[PDB]
Structures are given as structure tokens and as C-alpha cells.
Amino acid sequence: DGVGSSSGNWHCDSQWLGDRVITTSTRTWALPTYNNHLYKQISNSTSGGSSNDNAYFGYSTPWGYFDFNRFHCHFSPRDWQRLINNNWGFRPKRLNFKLFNIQVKEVTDNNGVKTIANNLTSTVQVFTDSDYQLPYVLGSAHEGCLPPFPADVFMIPQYGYLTLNDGSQAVGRSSFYCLEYFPSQMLRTGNNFQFSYEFENVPFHSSYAHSQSLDRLMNPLIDQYLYYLSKTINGSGQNQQTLKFSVAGPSNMAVQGRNYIPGPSYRQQRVSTTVTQNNNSEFAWPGASSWALNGRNSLMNPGPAMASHKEGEDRFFPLSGSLIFGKQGTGRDNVDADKVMITNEEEIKTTNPVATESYGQVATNHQSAQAQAQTGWVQNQGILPGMVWQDRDVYLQGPIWAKIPHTDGNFHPSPLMGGFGMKHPPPQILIKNTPVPADPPTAFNKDKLNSFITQYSTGQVSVEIEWELQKENSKRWNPEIQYTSNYYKSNNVEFAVNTEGVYSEPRPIGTRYLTRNL
Amino acid sequence: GEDRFFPLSGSLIFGKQGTGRDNVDADKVMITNEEEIKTTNPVATESYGQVATNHQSAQAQAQTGWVQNQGILPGMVWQDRDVYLQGPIWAKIPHTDGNFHPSP
């Protein structure tokens, strides 16, 4: 347990134990000193002003944090495929985290000549927010998670948070948190850290697509013992009204009585990939669906899970109804379509309404001898007893869990971005290099020291997660759809490294391949 | 009192003994009456209610709009469709990620 002894080994691989899968990942990280060892107040004001919808107030801290809330941090593409093609569901159960082989280095810069040396006596502080007393930052789809490729060395993201704001100002109820006011473990090179976590009960994610739709669940050979209004007129001409009824049969499925209806909706604007079909105007924000919270508007994104488009119109997508990842090396601003990957929420069209369509129509008056029957379009429909739906799919590059807000009420708290919702998700893990003062003056001074030895640390991280599988039990005769690689030759291998050594994930990968009845 | 009225497709209608399959007259069918639940459930052929649609001010008058369809709201209470001697007994709840009050 000293300077010349490793404090942990490299564990990286998966084990498939029947109904369970155990993924273990190790990456090597680097932690700089953030904020000059200072807690700093930030707002849209210190950010260079902004619009009201983007106003905020908060603090940036000198701490970093570990984040592995993305599936590719645990599953290799090959494993994701094994999961995807053979199970009807899965979910996390246990988690084991480790920090080891810490190395604190000191940088010296004299006359531009920079040099790095070990500072053996320096420490790094670590602690877990086991009681969720700090603002939960994971599950906001932030960058900075463990890289998908094991060989990549990553930089630990800086921790910051937001509280209540009134423009760029704070309010009485705004909270300020100091992470030093938390007990934390201190470790020198040769010391290590570790902890375990139990995932609370969460339903299995449905990694299947339905092999039949909500409106097509009857026996196509028999009639119902129910009738429907089929004629209100006996033919053109004056006073031709009547009431004729017919049996709802195979010949008219649209009219049949049903026990369950499609899930809720919130109409999204429809955008086309073949640009010339879109309106010649800027509607990215104007024509976007949104919600208001205390005078501020936020984009309804990704919103309720809805099918991306009608059958065949694959060139269409909801303005902000699906997740879109960037391809390897894609820039940050105004990037072209070809440099991004838009997820396709199609498999759920069997139960969820289409995002760019109306939920349906409702009557809006009392038809009478004088007035004709009128209908109106339902653009957004809240929950109704009898509704049934699927949740957003999850992706290899997508988030895994989210913290369910602690509130009096909520409904089906499944994270809208996809994933598992939990009141007590994996705790945040904060880390920071303990400040090491430079030589202080030889005469006392009450001011806090502001002269520090420049340092940064590096080490390994290990995350082991145990997943529970729900295996397939289909009696389907014909073969199923399976995720596969392309047979055809090509310059590079999909999900492999470049000739420059750049790993890249060519496309998003969902979980809905196997099928199941409704 | 307006017993002569019924929702276009809001109630179940069975056929009387021997009634044909197509374009049968009113007298040869039996339309169920979902009346007893008017104590908690809104009327099918009516609006749920009205909501404000603007900010009344010195210049603008208060305006309301009709709620033609209303999803669940915390605080709602209701009865489910009645069951009949000739009616169905059970149904299979679709195996899906979510659903609400899966009563057929």
C-alpha cells in the first residue's frame, strides 16, 4: 500500500451468465485543477447577457466528477448486439466503482521550459453524494462520460450547478453549496477508493417491437356482436334522414369497437431531409413545440415518445422529437445534416401516435336539422383511461438512467430522453486535487492564499455493472429481424479504429429488433 | 331528459334477436344507455368545460374557449363503463411499457 505498489488492476470485459450480464470497464483519466481552486458565481450575465429563455444563475466549482451514464461506457458494440438480438428486456441491478493508481503530478514552468514531476505527498479528494444533497447533474445528457473505446484517455468534466434565478439575479430561496462542507476521502498515490451501489427496482426496458398494432388485434374472420351507425341519410334529396346500423365485421375494421387506444401525444412540426420540400423561412424555433415554466420557454425536446413518421415517409422527422448524436469529429455549431445522426423512433408506431400527426378528431358541436356535424383536430392529447404505449427506445450512445425529481406528484417517471428513472440513481462521484500552497510570505497575512503549486492528477477508474436479462420466449415460426454488420467490403471496419487511430461509432443502435405480440 | 339522444359511437349497441347484418333500422337494434355515471363522468355529447384563452385587460375582454377533449388531471374522479348481460367479461391488457387505468 505504498509508492511502488499498484493499487488496482485493469478489469475490462463482460460475462454472460444466462439471465445476467456483467460488464466491467476500466479507463484511465486526467484531472486538472479547475477554477483556480475557487467557487465562482455564474449567470447569463457573467456569460455575456442573453435572452430571457436562457437566463440562469448558479455556481462553478473547483471539483470534477465521474460520469458513466451512457450505454457505450459499459457495452462493447459486439455485446450490445448480443443483448439486442437475444433478449426482450434488461435492467441494471448492482454497481461497483473503483479509483486507483492515482498519480499526482506537479508542473514547473520556468522561462517557457515546462517540466512535469511527481508530487508523492500530494492528495486527491473523493466523495459520493450518497444522500443526493447536491444538485444532480448526471442524466442531462452531458458530455464527459467514460469514452466508448477502452484505449482512450479522458479528461474529467468540471462540476457546476444552477439554482433559482430571476433574470441574471438570485432569489431568497437560491441555494449555495460548498463541496468542502462534505466529508471526503483523501488519497495519495498508493491509496485507492471504491464503493458499491444497489439499483432500486426498475422495470425492464422493452427491447422488442410489437408484431401487431393496436388497431389490428381482432380475429379477421369473425364479426363483432356490436353494431355501428352506418347511414344517417337514405340518399340525396330533401328530408332523407334515417338511422341504419351494421355489424362491425372484418370488412370494416376501422369501425370496430376496441378496448384500448393509442398513447398520448403533443404534435411536433415535420421537417424533411430533402431540403427543397421545407418552407423557405426560419422556423427552427418559431414553429417548434414548447412548454412554459415561469415565463421561460423551453423546447419540448424530446417530449412524449411518438413514432417519427408515417409508413415510408422516412425522409421526415419531428423538429425536436428524436435524439440526434453527432458523427465522429463533427463540429459544435451549424453542422450539416450529413455530419449528424438522427434516431428513428419507428418500431413504436404500433401503439404510439405519430409525432408529426394529430392524435385524431373530436366533435365540436351538436349536429341538428340546421347545423352540420363538425370535427376538430386534436393536436395534443393527455392521458385517458384505456391508453397504452411504449417508451422511448434506448441507444448504445444514449443515456442509461435519470434522477426522478423529488416532487409531490409525477406520472410514469420514465426519463423522456430514454432510460431508467430512479428516485435514488447511482450517486454523483466528485473528485478534486487538494490545493498545495506555493511558498507563503514570512510575515503573517490574514488574506486567503492565492498562490498555488500547479498540479494535475491521473489514474484509473473501474465500473462494474450487473444487468438482469429477460430472455425471449417467442413461438414465431419465421426468422426475426437482427442487428447485423454489412457483408460488403469497405475501407474501414464498422465500430473500429481509423488509420489515424480514431474510434468511431458509424450509427445509432436501438434495442428493438426482436418482436412480441401485443 | 334528452333520452332521445346518444353519442355517435359512445355506447355499445347489440342487435335484437334475428336482426340482419347490414343497414338495419333503429328498431332492430338495442343501444345501451350509460346514464347512471352522469354523477361523476362528463356528458359524451358535451364539452368538458371552458378555459380562459387570453389576458383580460383594460383593452381586451376576458375570453373563454371550449374544452372538447380533456386528458387526466390530478383530482379527477370517474366511473368505468358498465357491464351487460350480453356484454364482454374480460380483456387482455396489451403487454406494453405503459398504460393507464387498463380497464377495457
* Beta-bridge partner residues of A27: A461
Amino acid at A389: W
SS3 state of residue A251: helix
Report whether the peptide linkage leading into residue A302 is cis, meaning its omega lies within 30 degrees of zero: yes
A180 annotated as a binding-site residue: no
H, E, C per residue of A295-361 = CEEEECCCCCCCECCCCCCCCEEECCCCCEEECCCCCCCCCCHHHEEECCCCHHHHCCCECCCCCEE
Cα(A21)–Cα(A16) distance, integer angstroms: 5
C-alpha cell of residue A180: 468542502
SS3 state of residue A122: coil
Contact A382, B72 (CB under 8 A): yes
- Contacting residues for A437 by C-beta, under 8 A, at least 6 apart: A449, A451, A452, A453
| CA dist A146 → A154, A422, B64, B78 (Å) | 7, 21, 53, 49
Place of cell 441574471: A168
Contact A187, A123 (CB under 8 A): yes
Q: What is the resolution of this structure in A?
A: 2.8
Cα(A469)–Cα(A438) distance, integer angstroms: 54
DSSP label of A100: E
The pair phi, psi for residue A349, each rounded to 5°, is -70, -5
Hey, are the CB atoms on A385 and B72 less than 8 Å from each other? yes
Cα(A327)–Cα(A302) distance, integer angstroms: 19
**What pairing do the DSSP bridges indicate for beta strands A261-262 and A387-389?**
parallel
Contact A18, A449 (CB under 8 A): no
Whichever domain contains A220, its CATH number is 2.170.30.10
Cα(A92)–Cα(A73) distance, integer angstroms: 14
Q: In a 10 Å sphere around its CB, with 0-12 CB exposed, 13-18 middle and 19+ buried, how is residue A358 labelled?
A: middle
- Report how this structure was experimentally obtained: X-ray
- Contacting residues for A354 by C-beta, under 8 A, at least 6 apart: A306, A307, A308, A309, A310
Q: What angle do CA A208, A212, A213 make, to 5 degrees?
A: 105
A505 annotated as a binding-site residue: no
The radius of gyration of chain A's CA atoms, rounded to the nearest angstrom, is 28
Contact A438, A452 (CB under 8 A): yes
Candidates A424, A444, A481; CA nearest to A86 is A481
| CA dist A481 → A64, A84, A439, A514, A516 (Å) | 43, 11, 67, 6, 12
Cβ atoms within 10 Å, residue A387: 24
Amino acid at A342: I
**Nearest C-alpha of chain A: how many angstroms from B39?**
18
C-alpha cell of residue B5: 339522444
Amino acid at B67: V
- DSSP letters for A44-98: TTTTT---GGG--EEEEEEEEEE---BGGGT--HHHHHHHHHHEEEEEEEEEEEE
Cα(A242)–Cα(B90) distance, integer angstroms: 34
Candidates A333, A320, A241; CA nearest to A288 is A320
Phi and psi based region of residue A477 (left: phi greater than 0; alpha: psi -120 to 50; beta: remaining): alpha
Q: In a 10 Å sphere around its CB, with 0-12 CB exposed, 13-18 middle and 19+ buried, how is residue A426 labelled?
A: buried
Most distant CA pair in chain B, distance: 66
Q: What residues in B contact A245, CB-CB < 8 Å? A: 13, 15, 23-26, 28-29
Q: Name the residue facing B12 among A210, A214, A257 (closest C-beta).
A: A257
Chain A's closest residue to B28, CA to CA, is A245
Place of cell 509508492: A3
C-alpha cell of residue B60: 381586451
Cα(A123)–Cα(A111) distance, integer angstroms: 28
- Contacting residues for A179 by C-beta, under 8 A, at least 6 apart: A61, A63, A127, A134, A159, A430, A432
Domain range holding A292? 1-518
SS3 state of residue A210: strand
Candidates A367, A469, A513; CA nearest to A23 is A469
| CA dist A303 → A297, A417, B49 (Å) | 14, 8, 27
SS3 state of residue A36: helix
Contact A327, A340 (CB under 8 A): yes
**What pairing do the DSSP bridges indicate for beta strands A401-403 and A420-422?**
parallel
Contact A87, A471 (CB under 8 A): yes
Place of cell 450547478: A161
| CA dist A513 → A207, A209, A316 (Å) | 7, 6, 22
Q: Name the residue facing A246 among B24, B80, B86 (closest C-beta).
A: B24
User: Around A315, how many Cα atoms within 13 Å sit in the side-chain half-sphere?
Assistant: 7
Q: Name the residue facing A518 among B68, B80, B95 (closest C-beta).
A: B95
SS3 state of residue A179: helix
Cα(A262)–Cα(A390) distance, integer angstroms: 10
Cβ atoms within 10 Å, residue A511: 27
B54 annotated as a binding-site residue: no
Hey, are the CB atoms on B98 and A390 less than 8 Å from each other? yes
* Beta-bridge partner residues of A341: A325
Cα(A453)–Cα(A118) distance, integer angstroms: 12
- Contacting residues for A212 by C-beta, under 8 A, at least 6 apart: A350, A517, A518
Hey, are the CB atoms on A228 and B9 less than 8 Å from each other? yes
- Contacting residues for A166 by C-beta, under 8 A, at least 6 apart: none
Place of cell 498515490: A189
SS3 state of residue A180: helix
Contact A284, A301 (CB under 8 A): no
Q: How far apart are the first and last CA of chain A?
A: 57
Residues of B with CB under 8 A from a CB of A: 8-9, 12-15, 21-26, 28-29, 45, 66, 68-74, 78, 80, 86, 91, 93-104
Cα(A242)–Cα(A262) distance, integer angstroms: 32
A36 annotated as a binding-site residue: no
Contact A430, A159 (CB under 8 A): yes
Contact A387, A262 (CB under 8 A): yes
C-alpha cell of residue B25: 333500422
SS3 state of residue A275: helix
SS3 state of residue A106: strand
Cβ atoms within 10 Å, residue A302: 22
Contact A362, A375 (CB under 8 A): yes
Chain A's closest residue to B80, CA to CA, is A385
Contact A235, A215 (CB under 8 A): no
SS3 state of residue A8: coil
A contact test, residue of B97, B99, B101, B103 with most A CBs within 10 A: B97
Contact A261, A384 (CB under 8 A): yes
Cβ atoms within 10 Å, residue A378: 17
- Contacting residues for A365 by C-beta, under 8 A, at least 6 apart: A371, A373, A374
**Nearest C-alpha of chain A: how many angstroms from B75?**
12
Q: Name the residue facing B94 among A231, A243, A388 (closest C-beta).
A: A388
- Contacting residues for A399 by C-beta, under 8 A, at least 6 apart: A69, A70, A139, A141, A415, A417, A418, A419
A contact test, residue of B43, B78, B96, B101 with most A CBs within 10 A: B96
Contact A161, A135 (CB under 8 A): yes
Contact A404, A421 (CB under 8 A): yes
| Number of domains chain A is built from | 1
Q: What residues in A contact B103, CB-CB < 8 Å? A: 385-386
SS3 state of residue A124: strand
Q: In a 10 Å sphere around its CB, with 0-12 CB exposed, 13-18 middle and 19+ buried, how is residue A211 labelled?
A: middle
Cα(A482)–Cα(A369) distance, integer angstroms: 58
Cα(A75)–Cα(A82) distance, integer angstroms: 10
H, E, C per residue of chain B = CCCCCCCCCCCCEEECCCCCCCCEEHHHEEECCCCHHHHCCCCCCCCCEEEECCCCCCCCCCCEEEECCCCCCCCCCCCCCCCCCCCCCCCCCCCCCEECCCCC
* Beta-bridge partner residues of A318: A270
Candidates A30, A27, A35, A163; CA nearest to A97 is A27
**Nearest C-alpha of chain A: how many angstroms from B61?**
22
Contact A187, A432 (CB under 8 A): no
C-alpha cell of residue A163: 439554482
Cβ atoms within 10 Å, residue A414: 20
Chains A–B, number of C-beta pairs less than 8 Å apart: 121
C-alpha cell of residue A276: 427543397
Cα(A131)–Cα(A109) distance, integer angstroms: 41
| CA dist B52 → A417, B2, B65, B71, B74 (Å) | 32, 29, 6, 17, 19
Hey, are the CB atoms on A390 and B97 less than 8 Å from each other? yes
